């Protein structure tokens, strides 16, 4: 039903109480929605901003029941929720996002198929389930190549880059531990992402293309506008609309891409949720990805996605938090977001800072001059 509207005043239920849910919840609260959250850990980032907290396991098909009960619409922010858990909600509650898109994007192999069905380029890949299949995959794809677990991967965990035969021993260890795909290395010039939003009624908006810098396989910086040709942007944007189409998107889709020196774009992966590379939108766009996500599922008119000022988002990990607090008096032109996580771990995402400036290169220099991310800048040398 493409006409159903969840009006301000109603309750939005969110599965997963991480920072993405917290930010959804804050954007929803501005519009006067109530918020219920289910998370296995008490006092999660999202519970700190929610009206109702359900502390329970993600597979607990009774707590989930209770979430459905108290909510007028349900969404997820946790991308590794059991797809069969969602299936109950779309059957017996209101989950306009569906379970289909999630199941496709959760598995790298099935994800590759969806992208190829849509007609867009991917790195050439093979499924790997044992050593014989790894051996054949390497023989067919050669070097350089990258082995990735088909499920559960994040921050490059469950990945091995095969530069030469010397890396095969490490690849074999991983291939034994989990189902994987081997895919060709893409010698891209830049990584970019595009966040596309589509409402229950089919209205579609796309955010500006962000140029992403990863360090140790964790997002470090998002740069908007991406320093790429107008031609690449229109292509990146067209690619995202196509994906929203073929996947019948309702809600948010983050599309990560590789841009090669000849202006070709390879789709790296999809996330059916607000994405770290869209955090810049909170301070630099007319609508944030979180505001958009809420409007999409509630079937409100979408907001505009104009870039109102250039921006560099910098991630704040556990290893940075001390530096941030010490350097707080130097954060002029910097828009701090901290997620309320009670325990820092070195590489855990604790917050982000959006650095706004008319000139993108001055924003970049600001990040450097703060010295908070010396570890990242040293690794990028």
Ligand X SMILES: Nc1ncnc2c1ncn2[C@@H]1O[C@H](COP(=O)(O)OP(=O)(O)O)[C@@H](O)[C@H]1O
Nearest distance in Å: CB 183, ligand X:
4
Nearer to its own copies, 192 or 285 (CB): 285
Which of 29, 172, 214, 241 lies at the binding interface for its own copies (CB under 8 A)? Answer: 29
The SS3 call for residue 259 is strand
Containing H/E element for 53?
Answer: strand 52-55
User: CB under 5 to 8 A by kind: which of its own copies, Mg ion, ligand X, none does 77 bind?
Assistant: none
User: CB under 5 to 8 A by kind: which of ligand X, Mg ion, its own copies, none does 156 bind?
Assistant: ligand X
Q: Is residue 179 a contact partner of residue 149, using CB atoms and an 8 Å limit? A: yes
- 168-177 helix and 131-141 helix, angle to the nearest 10 degrees: 130
Tokens matching residue 290: 């979180």
**Does 362 participate in binding its own copies (rule CB under 8 A)?**
no
Site for its own copies in 203-232 (CB under 8 A): none
**Does 155 participate in binding Mg ion (rule CB under 5 A)?**
no
Nearest distance in Å: CB 123, ligand X:
4
Nearer to its own copies, 164 or 332 (CB): 332
Site for Mg ion in 171-200 (CB under 5 A): none
Nearest distance in Å: CB 332, its own copies:
4
**How does DSSP assign 171-229, residue by residue?**
HHHHHHHS-EEEEE----SEEEEEEEEE-TT--EEEPPPEEEEEETTEEEEEEES-SS-
Nearer to ligand X, 191 or 211 (CB): 191
Which of 164, 329, 359, 378 lies at the binding interface for its own copies (CB under 8 A)? Answer: 329
Contacts for 358 with CB less than 8 Å, ≥ 6 apart: 309, 310
Site for Mg ion in 241-280 (CB under 5 A): 256, 269-270
**Does 301 participate in binding its own copies (rule CB under 8 A)?**
yes
Neighbours of 343 (CB within 10 A): 7
Q: Which of 109, 112, 114 is nearest to 133 (CA)?
A: 109
How many residues at the interface with Mg ion, by CB under 5 A? 4
Q: What is the binding site for Mg ion (CB under 5 A)? A: 105, 256, 269-270
């Amino acid at each position: 039903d493409m006409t159903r509207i969840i009006l301000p005043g109603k309750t939005i239920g969110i599965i997963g109480g991480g920072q993405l849910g917290r930010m959804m919840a804050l954007a929803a609260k501005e519009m006067g929605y109530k918020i219920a959250v289910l998370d296995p850990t008490k006092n999660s980032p999202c519970a700190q901003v929610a009206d109702i907290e359900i502390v329970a396991s993600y597979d607990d098909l009774k707590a989930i029941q209770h979430l459905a009960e108290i909510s007028d619409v349900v969404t997820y922010e946790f991308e590794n929720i059991d797809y069969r858990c969602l299936q109950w909600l779309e059957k017996h509650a209101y989950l306009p996002q569906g379970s289909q898109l999630l199941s496709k994007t959760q598995n790298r192999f099935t994800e590759k198929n969806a992208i190829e069905k849509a007609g867009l380029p991917v790195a050439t890949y093979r499924l790997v389930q044992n050593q014989e299949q790894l051996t054949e995959a390497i023989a067919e794809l050669s070097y350089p190549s990258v082995l990735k677990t088909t499920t559960g991967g994040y921050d490059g965990k469950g990945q091995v880059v095969l530069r030469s035969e010397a890396d095969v021993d490490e690849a074999r260890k991983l291939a034994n531990a989990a189902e994987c795909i081997l895919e060709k290395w893409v010698p891209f010039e830049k990584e970019v992402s595009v966040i596309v939003i589509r409402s229950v009624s089919g209205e579609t908006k796309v955010f500006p293309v962000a140029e992403n810098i990863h360090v140790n396989n964790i997002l470090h910086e998002s740069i908007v506008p991406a320093r790429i040709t107008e031609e690449l942007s229109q292509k990146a944007i067209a690619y995202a609309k196509v994906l929203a189409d073929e996947l019948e998107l309702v809600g948010t889709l983050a599309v990560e891409m590789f841009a090669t020196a000849d202006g070709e774009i390879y789709i790296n992966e999809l996330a059916p949720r607000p994405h770290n590379s869209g955090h810049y939108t909170q301070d630099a766009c007319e609508t944030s990805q979180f505001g958009q996500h809420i409007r999409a599922i509630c079937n409100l008119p979408l907001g505009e996605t104009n870039l109102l000022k250039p921006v560099v988002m910098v991630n704040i990990l556990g290893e940075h938090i001390e530096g941030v607090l010490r350097q707080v008096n130097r954060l002029t032109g910097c828009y701090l977001h901290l997620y309320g996580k009670e325990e820092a771990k070195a590489q855990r995402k604790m917050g982000h800072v959006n650095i706004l400036n008319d000139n993108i290169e001055v924003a970049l220099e600001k990040a450097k001059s703060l010295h908070i991310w010396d570890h990242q800048e040293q690794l990028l040398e």
